[PDB]
């Protein structure tokens, strides 16, 4: 009677440097937050947690509109360690907790945290994308299936967390976009979803290849002022791409194996299989975030 | 009368973020235009114009791009200040100028008292004697309005007001360093021709007794240019001292006005370190911290 094949789910959330009006921005992690959920005992473990500020190297001074959005003050990032150091602490934390790779999974509220943010930051820091970041549970996508299954209803909230909270009629915990408060909301929503009979398992995988990247991107000249169109650019720039999987077709043994090429994930990923050369040739209108990360 | 054979009109643009004044401004454009004094000749063909790549804030905020007009690509293909600065140094020698016989000219005290001084802390370059005496064109202008009589001016910036007064057309666009530079040379020209005393009127000094007493702290300073000025004044080792029109003398290069020492001696340490400002690590001063002032 556990649909969820993992013993422990790790609710994950990143906050990043940003500049609202500009999507051609090299987001760097400024907050790394995780809270554990005990699957067999159905318990949110608020005492098993990871919560560190991260110091950027590219944009060391937080945009004012970034501190208003995230609530993070400049002092907390000036005393923080850089990402390579905070990432290694995280690695160390997993170890002390005795988590067997492939028997835990990360839970996020959208594709953004792992497909975009982890990938890009990891490129900046020259760290290989780990297997446990290459499969995950997009809780928003399970949520949308749960709506279809139980009955859609009118939602006024604008964020994924907000909507889920509204639909299950849960009270918002803390403030929006404070990473740890985001984690506790997600954990709570997740717990509610499970008690309502949802099957919570990995639904998104990161993959070297997609056939819709075979067709070149039809370029929007004004992509820098739109989150959606910038997403499309990120999709072509980043080596890995999101492939979905149905709940019944997922297997724990897929861990560490690329869904597309079937190679091990210590091999797959090391070079871009679909480099978007068509976007890298107009030297007059360059993509800043691709340049600064060394994609060209 | 004006004791310099050649005047160098210097302007900087920096990284910024309009609504945050606790910001580590970095040079992104460095422009200079020569002015021949004996020939009264603005020399547009003797110039320095370079973009500079930041290291703290590599991505220009949108509002910085809007304000300065500089696009991200021009900064991504540029060298860092240390390289651009050695280029500037190399360019100087090209001009064959006699030591202490040229002076810099700015529209305000910002370019050299704040921007150069701070950038040069970041880059670990010693503040040069020729940046510790300069001509603040606006102060002279202020004085020219007493002599020649006032006007009600609706213009908004130092360069704007001066152009309005001397009834001069705006050259190029505001906040392009070179465009700023040309307007300043042009204004400088009319001023001299209308009878202005043009000389070094501002000196950079190790010490001033108005930093003896701690600053009256304003919790909301980060949203005000004026109030952030006050804290910049305490953080930076060198402070602006004023010298009257007739009083400057060529051989003041480069001895510090306060302590009378050579400007290789005076200059190394901060003689008035504002310890009282560096005590509340629940409200720290970001620009002082990234620069290593504490
Ligand atoms: Er978040
Ligand atoms: Er300027
Ligand atoms: Zn693959
Ligand atoms: Zn001195």
Swiss-Prot record, chain A:
Changing residue 13 to A: Reduces DNase activity. Abolishes DNase activity. Pfam families: RNase_T. InterPro entries: 3-5_Exoribonuclease, ERI-1_3'hExo-like, Exonuclease_RNaseT/DNA_pol3, RNaseH-like_sf, RNaseH_sf. It is an enzyme of class 3 (hydrolase). GO terms for molecular function: 3'-5' exonuclease activity; 3'-5'-RNA exonuclease activity; DNA endonuclease activity; DNA nuclease activity; metal ion binding; RNA nuclease activity; single-stranded DNA binding. Zn(2+) binds at residues 208, 258, 261, 268. PANTHER family: 3'-5' EXONUCLEASE ERI1-RELATED (PTHR23044), CELL DEATH-RELATED NUCLEASE 4 (PTHR23044:SF4). This is 3'-5' exonuclease crn-4. It comes from Caenorhabditis elegans.
